[PDB]
Structure of Cytoplasmic protein NCK2:
Amino acid sequence: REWYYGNVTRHQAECALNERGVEGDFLIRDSESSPSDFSVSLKASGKNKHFKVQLVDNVYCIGQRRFHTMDELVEHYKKAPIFTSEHGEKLYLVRALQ
């Protein structure tokens, strides 16, 4: 309802995870500046993992890799910058707030 409005990260992401590293909150947003630009930030133990999503050569890249998906990887965190921690679990690409 109030998660994906068109732009929610970098500035809004903090406006939602202001807490500074709360739960596995991840949000991806389109970059009005570009036609195929997407950005998403996740929360961690006091840390904030931000990644850039750009469409390269008819491909959808996320962070520092290329995948066949762009803003759909947040639905099933497929080959997404998602990463697991010893007892922190996978940095899952979900959504903004509950």
